[PDB]
């Protein structure tokens, strides 16, 4: 399956594409300001995740640190990225389906549209600005919004038990962006597409 990965920031970024144990293609490449980047990801992909990392610096062998989203230093990724960032997330071809999703489950960073290009289903959106809104003691110094389970480390946010509630931070997320997950226990935003569906993810899809 193809995920074109669209820089519409004013600012540039570097995608990120992992399943936590293993890169998705090159795993990551800087974006400037319009790029496009098209990458391939293997069918029946598990909780693959695309993201975007900022204010990053890589050496000349792809090592370096990023202030959200860095995934141990590497350009290439090959596991999942520091909150806070904002996460497309899917699994390819599971029993014939495909899913998708938008999750603010880790904090926010970068706005994102997460769609499919092909038919039989429709996209997932988290555009506010979520960084700009940001309730004081989720603001990330590094930048961007952080979770309250990353901030505050208890079992209601982290929902260790299993049996967590929504909270105040959780539901600045949802309020803000409706369409993505804002706790583990969200009452679930994902889409079933048809299986083998193509996508693209834009950053800052809208002005």
Known sequence: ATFEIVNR?????WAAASKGDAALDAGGRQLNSGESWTINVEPGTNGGKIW?????????????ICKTGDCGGLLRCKRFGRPPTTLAEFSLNQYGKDYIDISNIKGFNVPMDFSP??????????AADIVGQCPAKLKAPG?????????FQTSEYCCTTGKCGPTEYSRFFKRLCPDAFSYVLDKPTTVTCPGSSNYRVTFCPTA
């Open 9 to 13: 920031c004013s600012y540039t970024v």
């Open 52 to 64: 975007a990392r900022t204010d990053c610096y890589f050496d000349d062998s792809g090592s370096g």
């Open 117 to 126: 290009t092909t038919r039989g289903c429709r996209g997932v959106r988290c």
């Open 143 to 151: 930048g961007g919004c952080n979770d309250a389970c990353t901030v």
